[PDB]
Structures are given as structure tokens and as C-alpha cells.
Write a protein that binds this ligand. Structure first.
Ligand SMILES: C[C@H](Sc1ccccn1)C(=O)O
Lengths: 300, 237
């Protein structure tokens, strides 16, 4: 198990670690988070008590370095940093565990929720969406726009999600206008899966990452990306059966984890009703349709 | 964006534009089968593509063979319209290509936008006007050429005949829409009005009779009276 120590907590802040969160009071003796499961990407995220503006956070994988958090009073935020000195880092962490200044990642042993939300998410792929190559970890916040959002403005602080646009020449073969607009299988399978993602695991990884950024940061462009990637599958007549089965599982756990109170902003009525009721795959998402009907029947 | 009565003069500026009406593309008669079921028989149709400034009507005739063996014809018909309009645009020299295409029905927006992705500078727009272009088939010469066609065919008509020699396109379009509104509301009476007087004839190269300015005022007044009349019979006023 790994540890993200904090130099200190000078400002009152709600800290999230994956789907968990806890409050730290201004200058409380908090020195970080311990017992973090190895083997998964993680995200540690922040919402200042004094200024809920800018949820922000850091995607990271404990197998890629020793990372810690330090408040920067000039930029006014908790910064992720890497410690290259391995011995210094173990020495710091041990001292803080001995004095019990750390919250324990509270993983219930029956619980696969985080695995199920991050199954296909890889740090190497995250780092190509979030371009900041001098850090092994990736910063996201509430207000970051996507490459597609900038086309419709700083390119260094964007989310470079794969552009999906159903009324684009990429999506529509000349002479197959009707066929391709009404059945996106060409766009899904040839353009996106074979052409861009290489496989469905990379497609699902982006989809899951978009969802998580929408949920944890209220990042609007991520929510658009999550819905576009669902719609592209739902609107394709020809989808490998294993992708549909896995998609149903993926969406199921996303719907399960979403705060009940955030459903109005994070869920797009048109896409979901289309996916569940009108689309080629209306009968293919059994687990997703059943949780959606029982938990958010208002949306439908 | 959409087109309405606030920006009505834009139709007559010097930006090339076309209206596209697809309401006569897919046409059927509905009849009983020997087994007492119902079946449709398609008949020839046409795309009504009109430059409102010039009066140029590109009438693409839709021969019934285009439907053979096809499913979901009402949906195919919108895509077939969009394909033909796109083919028309590509066939025109660049400086004759429209800067805007206004569809009379909003269901044509996506089919046409998709067919025209190659032309990102051509604006595809709806309109809030209720244009009576469906009545184009009440114009005998246009009806005749559609029903006689044995194959796909594009026919060129000037829907304003020679009117632009004497009036503006604004007034000519207003006359056309009044005539078509009338024909759409009571075709028999509209035609009675237009042809009652045998001394006024339709030139061979025209669609409408050769009315002098004074006679057009009378005709136009009679057509208003007809529309008003039918509005009365309809609503009991
Ligand atoms: C042939 C012309 S009308 C027209 C329509 C479309 C393209 C060209 N001209 C006429 O009868 O006056």
C-alpha cells in the first residue's frame, strides 16, 4: 500500500481521494492519506472551504513515483509534487504514520467500485489528454475546456479528448450520407475503434476518464465527451457483443456512483432516453437501463 | 439562423439563396387491396428549388422508380432531396452557388447539412414563414411535366414569367405566394379566377396568364377574397 503525504494543510479544504472525501480544518494536523491500493490509477482532489470555485485535482498512479501534496500560498492551491529522493520520502512517511497524522483510504473489501469505474483508465493515456509532460501526474480542474470546446482558449490547459462530431466529414462517408448519419457503425468501428483508439479498451478508458472528470470536478466538457462516446455506441447498429456487454457494466457503475443530487447537471436527457429507448442498443443495456429506471426515473 | 417576418427583405438582397421544398418529393395514393388491406401506390414527385430573387425554379422530377425496393420512404425522401440539392449545387459554377439554402420543413435541416458538409460556407437555415410551395403541383404546366416523366429529369421554369420586367422581386414573390396560397386553399376557385376570361392567355413559354398591371391588381384582389372566403367557410365567420 502507498501513501501521499501532505506537508501541511494551511487552509480548510474538502479533500477527495477517488470516491471518498473528508473535511480538513484550517491548520489541522493533517499529513496525508495512507493505505492507498496499489494497482489502480487514483485521483486526489480539492475544494477549498473558503472558495468552492475551482474544484481541482491530480490523477496519478503510485507505481510511477513518490508523490506528495504541498500548499502553495502564492498560487493558492494544494500542489502535487514528486519526490525523487526515495529515502527522504520513506523517512517522511514513516514519521507521519508513527504519529498517526494520516487518514486511511477506507476500502471495504467487498467493494470493487473503484476498479469498476477505472477498469480501462491508464495513466499513459491520461497524460496524452492532459498535456503537461514534465509531471508524472495530471492536473484537472472544473474550468478546463476541451480541444473541441476551443474550436467552437489556451491550448496548454485544455483537455485533449478525442474529437467526436456526428456532422463532420470524418463521421460521414461521401455517398453514404444517410447510411452513416443514421447508423454510426462506420464512424465507431472504422474511424474511431480501428483508426484512432486501436481497441475498445482505449475507447472505454477515455470514456471512463471523461465521466470521472465530469463527476469529480463538474467539468462540463468532460460530461459532453462522456455522453458523446456513449451516443456513438448507442447509435451504431453494429457493435461487437463484448463491447456492449462491457459498456452496460461500465455505465451501470457510473450511474451507481453518481450523487443523486447531481443528476440534473451530469446527465443528458436526450442521450440517455435515446440510448435506452430509441437507439439500436435500446435492448442491449439491461443493467444500465434497470438502474437508470429505478434511480432516475424522472430523467425518463 | 431561422427565417421570419423580421428579416423578410433579406430574401431579395444580392446574396444568392434558394428555398428548397420537399413536400412533393414522395407522393402516394392510398387504396384498398383485394384482400381488403390498404396499400400505397407512389406517383412521380418533384423537388421545388427556387431562387426567390430571380424566379429560377430548378424542378427536379422524382420518378417513382427511385422508390423501388426501398424501405422507410418518407425518411429516404428527405435524404434523396438533400442528395439532389447537393448535386444541383455542385453542378453550378461557383459564382452561381447559393450562399444560403432555406428549407421549408425543419426535417430537411440535418439531411441537407450532412449532404453539404463539403460546403461549410453555405448556410442551411429553416424558416418560420408558412410558404405554400406544396401547391406548386397545382400549376398545370409543372404538374404535367412531373406526371409525364418516365425517368428522373431536371426541368428549368421561371416561376415569375416576365414579371420582373415590371415589378420588383419582393412584389413578385408576394404575388407568387398569394397565388400559391390561394391554389392551396381552394384550387378550383383559384384556377377559375386565373382562367375565367378566355381573352387572357398563358404564353407558351409562361406558367401564368399575361395579365396587365391593372388585371393583376384585380386578380390579386380576387385571390385575397378567395383566401378570406375559405377562411370564412372553414371557421364559420
Ligand atoms: C429557363 C428560364 S428559367 C431558369 C430556371 C433555372 C435555371 C435557368 N433558367 C426561363 O424559362 O425563363
Amino acid at each position: 500500500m502507498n501513501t501521499v503525504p501532505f506537508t501541511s494543510a494551511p487552509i480548510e479544504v474538502t479533500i477527495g481521494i477517488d470516491q471518498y472525501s473528508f473535511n480538513v480544518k484550517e491548520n489541522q494536523p493533517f499529513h496525508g492519506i495512507k493505505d492507498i491500493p496499489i494497482g489502480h490509477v487514483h485521483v486526489i482532489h480539492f475544494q477549498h472551504a473558503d472558495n468552492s470555485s475551482m474544484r481541482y485535482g491530480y490523477w496519478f498512479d503510485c507505481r510511477m513515483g513518490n508523490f506528495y501534496i504541498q500548499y502553495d500560498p502564492k498560487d493558492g492551491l494544494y500542489k502535487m509534487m514528486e519526490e525523487r529522493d526515495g529515502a527522504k520520502f520513506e523517512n517522511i512517511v514513516h514519521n507521519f504514520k508513527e504519529r498517526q497524522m494520516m487518514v486511511s483510504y477506507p476500502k471495504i473489501d467487498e467493494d470493487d467500485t473503484w476498479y469498476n469505474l477505472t477498469e480501462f483508465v491508464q495513466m499513459d493515456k491520461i497524460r496524452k489528454i492532459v498535456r503537461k509532460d514534465e509531471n508524472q501526474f495530471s492536473y484537472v480542474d472544473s474550468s478546463m475546456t476541451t480541444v473541441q470546446e476551443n474550436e467552437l482558449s489556451d491550448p496548454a490547459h485544455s483537455l485533449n479528448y478525442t474529437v467526436i462530431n456526428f456532422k463532420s466529414r470524418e463521421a460521414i462517408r461521401p455517398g453514404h450520407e444517410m447510411e452513416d448519419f443514421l447508423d454510426k457503425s462506420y464512424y465507431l468501428n472504422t474511424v474511431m475503434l480501428q483508426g484512432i483508439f486501436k481497441n475498445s479498451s482505449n475507447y472505454f478508458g477515455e470514456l471512463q476518464f471523461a465521466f470521472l472528470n465530469a463527476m469529480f470536478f463538474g467539468n462540463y466538457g468532460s460530461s459532453l465527451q462522456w455522453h458523446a462516446m456513449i451516443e456513438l455506441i448507442c447509435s451504431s447498429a453494429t457493435v461487437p457483443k463484448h463491447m456492449l456487454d462491457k459498456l452496460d457494466e461500465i455505465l451501470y457503475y457510473q450511474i451507481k456512483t453518481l450523487p443523486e443530487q447531481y443528476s440534473d447537471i451530469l446527465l443528458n436527457e436526450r442521450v440517455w432516453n435515446i440510448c435506452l429507448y430509441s437507439s439500436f442498443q435500446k435492448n442491449s443495456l439491461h443493467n444500465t437501463e434497470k438502474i437508470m429506471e429505478n434511480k432516475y426515473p424522472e430523467l425518463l | 439562423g431561422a427565417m421570419n417576418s423580421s428579416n423578410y427583405a433579406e430574401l431579395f438582397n444580392n446574396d444568392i439563396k434558394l428555398f428548397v421544398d420537399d413536400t412533393n418529393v414522395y407522393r402516394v395514393t392510398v387504396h384498398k387491396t383485394f384482400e381488403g388491406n390498404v396499400a400505397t401506390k407512389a406517383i412521380n414527385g418533384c423537388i421545388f428549388t427556387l431562387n426567390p430573387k430571380t424566379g429560377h425554379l430548378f424542378l427536379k422530377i422524382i420518378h417513382t422508380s427511385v422508390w423501388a425496393g426501398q424501405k422507410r420512404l418518407s425518411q429516404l425522401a428527405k435524404w434523396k432531396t438533400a442528395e439532389e440539392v447537393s448535386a444541383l449545387v455542385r453542378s453550378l459554377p461557383k459564382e452561381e452557388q447559393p450562399k444560403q439554402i432555406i428549407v421549408t420543413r425543419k426535417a430537411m435541416l440535418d439531411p441537407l447539412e450532412v449532404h453539404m458538409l463539403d460546403f461549410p460556407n453555405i448556410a442551411i437555415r429553416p424558416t418560420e414563414l408558412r410558404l405554400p410551395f406544396s401547391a406548386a403541383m397545382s400549376i398545370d404546366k409543372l404538374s404535367d411535366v412531373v406526371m409525364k416523366a418516365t425517368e428522373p429529369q431536371m426541368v428549368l421554369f421561371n416561376i415569375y414569367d416576365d414579371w420582373l420586367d415590371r415589378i420588383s422581386s419582393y412584389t413578385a414573390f408576394s404575388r407568387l405566394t398569394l397565388l400559391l396560397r390561394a391554389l392551396k386553399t381552394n384550387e378550383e376557385s383559384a384556377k377559375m379566377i386565373l382562367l375565367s376570361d378566355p381573352t387572357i392567355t398563358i404564353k407558351s413559354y409562361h406558367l401564368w396568364p399575361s395579365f396587365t398591371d391593372e388585371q393583376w391588381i384585380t386578380i390579386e384582389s380576387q385571390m385575397r377574397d378567395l383566401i378570406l372566403t375559405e377562411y370564412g367557410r372553414k371557421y364559420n365567420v
